[PDB]
């Protein structure tokens with residue numbers, strides 16, 4: 009059994025009937041107009057993201073799912089900050105593929121819908137499900153481009169989507185499996201499979217201690233799970249000495265909050281508190297697969313945050329790699345602690361830019377939810393590049409303020425140079441960002457608080473319920489454009 | 495006794511000593527160099543916002559307070575989104591005036607510090623205190639410009655600051671005094687004192703019922719305090735038919751949350767839940783005092799949100815003026831309910847723009863705190879105008895997303911067209927904004943969630959602890975520039 013997903017646009021006022029994509033019209037022609045005929049008979053027109061299934065139209069395609077693509081000329085939506093057409097395609101195709109999968113069809117050919125990359129992303133992101141630990145699973149669906157004219161674009165979409173799906177897998181996987189060591193090993197095998205122009209160092213605790221990362225170590229010690237500092241190098245630049253772009257990701261494989269223990273409700277989701285590491289590492293893996301002509305370094309401090317007889321204690325003062333002391337008033341604000349040391353280390357690479365990602369604050373979720381990743385940056389150039397890339401990917405970013413106003417609230421510290429929690433409970437994502445900035449001197453640094461986009465329920469149509477792996481594609485697009493432009 | 499506030503800048507590397515402002519150097523000359531001499535003797539240089547008091551330098555000024563103005567050439571700070579020099583002046587002067595007041599001196603002359611408006615704002619905003627109900631009060635200080643060359647700029651500052659102080663007074667005043675009726679009467683007398691080219695209508699409940707404002711009425715009915723719909727007109731345009739700019743403000747004189755009752759802790763601050771009305775009305779009063787050549791309409795639905803035998807009940811469905819039904823799942827999300835009707839009414843004026851302000855969500859506070867007012871708008875032109883004005887005033891704004899992503903979460907309603915609370919608890923300010931947008935069809939609408947800037951502790955140096963009256967000056971500046979530019 010082989011399924012087929014075909015797109016149809018919303019009817020324009022000047023048109024007598026909704027128009028099929030080129031593939032749709034061709035298939036209709038192939039079946040002597042039976043597709044149009046049955047679609048007409050089926051009832052109301054298919055709107056954006058809606059689907060309808062027709063059976064027995066062609067011996068090779070017992071199941072044909074037509075999906076609504078919305079307005080054919082839908083481009084950049086000035087109000088939504090994204091290319092609407094691409095988003096329509098991703099959603100429609102995802103919906104179509106899910107329908108094919110529900111019919112238990114193992115193979116599906118997908119209409120490029122005028123944008124093969126978007127179509128591929130919809131199919132690949134849409135079909136993804138982390139079901140490795142389930143006895144009962146949906147049929148594995150192999151999605152392929154319908155036709156052979158948009159191959160590179162289609163594969164580009166598969167690549168981008170696969171990068172995000174890698175992040176989703178890493179985030180979704182339970183923490184007892186996805187330990188710091190396991191995460192590092194999976195990223196290592198993926199990066200090495202992507203290109204041999206790579207180096208991966210799964211730095212052990214001894215190295216971390218040697219690097220004087222007391223902040224990171226303070227978080228890790230509460231747990232019996234060994235911490236690791238993942239360092240990955242992708243040497244894509246023609247010039248080996250070319251300064252690299254450095255990505256840093258919060259890799260808390262599991263966050264119980266530590267002594268400042270979290271509430272039980274939905275704490276299981278904290279297995280994705282390493283989403284920052286997942287997204288930046290996956291983006292680098294994808295950059296390597298794209299063979300981007302740039303040098304990139306990925307840094308991911310990985311550990312668990314657990315309560316125990318040797319765990320971080322509220323009030324404890326720890327020393328970051330840069331010598332700055334930190335008062336750990338709340339052990340559940342551990343992401344900024346490990347990032348302090350990772351960000352310090354990031355400067356040793358004399359990077360062109362430093363971008364960190366982290367499921368850093370619930371405040372970010374309360375601020376923008378899953379609508380967009382919050383971006384704190386001291387460079388409007390960098391903000392604009394990330395923003396422009398997000399318009400293309402649809403995985404939106406929204407700028408958040410890096411004001412001294414917030415810095416003042418974290419450096420007002422009773423015992424040390426900086427407190428790991430603001431003196432007020434307001435603007436949690438902003439004070440967390442201000443804290444990170446105290447460990448950054450680089451002129452082009454961007455902090456992405458992805459706590460709000462850590463999961464998906466139904467907000468992003470082409471992502472099934474679960475860890476979202478956002479905004480991996482936006483980072484990939486950013487890297488791609490940087491390798492071409494910047 | 496008459497005090498004197500003089501400014502001194504931070505020493506530049508090329509300078510041999512920190513430089514006084516023109517007024518400072520002149521005074522020093524007047525006292526034969528004794529000011530410089532004593533300042534030198536006093537110790538370390540005065541940094542931005544710091545002050546030092548010197549006594550007996552001149553028979554007419556027994557107390558002279560020198561204040562640090564920071565870098566003389568401090569201009570627009572690209573990272574802080576404000577004119578740093580103006581902010582330095584406001585803070586320094588406020589500090590100086592507070593010192594003069596502590597010395598119980600009733601009159602103070604203030605150095606224009608190279609920017610008389612900023613100096614005036616610092617003095618007027620800085621000295622303000624709502625102490626009408628206190629037996630023990632600080633000495634009333636009369637601040638005046640030192641010299642007579644920067645009079646218009648100084649008075650402009652006093653005007654802007656007075657506008658904000660009016661908002662602060664309205665917000666700070668206890669709700670049993672600042673009732674809907676009282677608020678309306680105070681705004682009325684202030685607007686009428688500002689210009690005779692005005693009309694004020696304190697619309698009674700009967701009018702509100704006539705206007706079919708069922709949403710607004712649903713909120714008000716729980717309380718015995720009569721609701722009023724304040725409608726103010728400022729006819730500043732040379733052309734009476736010139737479309738007006740319409741401002742709308744949430745005027746909940748007191749919010750107990752209603753049946754969805756609030757927690758006791760700090761609920762007293764909800765006497766400022768009419769801050770939206772306070773800021774937009776005050777801005778209009780100030781626009782009138784500035785005699786801006788534009789037509790402006792101010793709309794402020796005013797009422798209390800109280801629990802009682804006839805109060806809004808969770809689940810109740812009310813009908814807005816535009817016929818849209820609203821499911822009131824949480825009676826404490828009442829601001830959007832009254833704004834729905836006010837925003838609908840705003841369209842009847844065929845306005846050029848519609849800007850509403852409201853202490854709408856705690857989510858906004860969690861998002862940006864008092865760092866900046868969150869601005870939701872469907873017009874980048876409008877956003878940019880507000881942003882540019884905020885750079886000048888220092889009362890910053892930060893854009894927040896108006897995405898369908900959030901709309902979907904409020905129109906997913908069990909009983910009606912729209913639910914007054916999102917289906918998820920994330921992005922509270924965004925879903926609240928999305929709710930408002932369902933009552934807006936205008937192409938240039940901006941919603942300002944000022945919940946985070948409702949109060950000040952010490953974030954804004956020139957504002958004493960209490961209701962902040964923000965971002966009144968930014969609205970005034972916006973209006974001023976619009977009357978000149980747009």
Ligand SMILES: C[C@H](CS)C(=O)N1C[C@@H](Sc2ccccc2)C[C@H]1C(=O)O
Pocket residue numbers: 263281338340341342343367368369370371429430433436459
């Ligand atoms: C998503 C983050 C990172 S794991 C997180 O859970 N935080 C960070 C801080 S916020 C915070 C909460 C209360 C007082 C001070 C800060 C602690 C914890 C929390 O919200 O209680």
Ligand SMILES: C[C@H](CS)C(=O)N1C[C@@H](Sc2ccccc2)C[C@H]1C(=O)O
Pocket residue numbers: 749767824826827828829853854855856857915916919922945
């Ligand atoms: C500042 C605002 C306006 S008065 C406010 O207090 N809200 C608005 C809503 S948010 C909300 C809270 C829980 C569920 C749904 C929405 C209710 C109340 C609150 O936070 O509990």
Ligand code: NA
Pocket residue numbers: 178179180181182183186261279280282
């Ligand atoms: Na995980």
Ligand code: NA
Pocket residue numbers: 664665666667668669672747765766768
């Ligand atoms: Na009040």
Ligand SMILES: [Zn+2]
Pocket residue numbers: 263265313339340341342343
């Ligand atoms: Zn935590």
Ligand SMILES: [Zn+2]
Pocket residue numbers: 260263281340342343367368
């Ligand atoms: Zn965490």
Ligand SMILES: [Zn+2]
Pocket residue numbers: 749751799825826827828829
């Ligand atoms: Zn309320």
Ligand SMILES: [Zn+2]
Pocket residue numbers: 746749767826828829853854
């Ligand atoms: Zn309220």
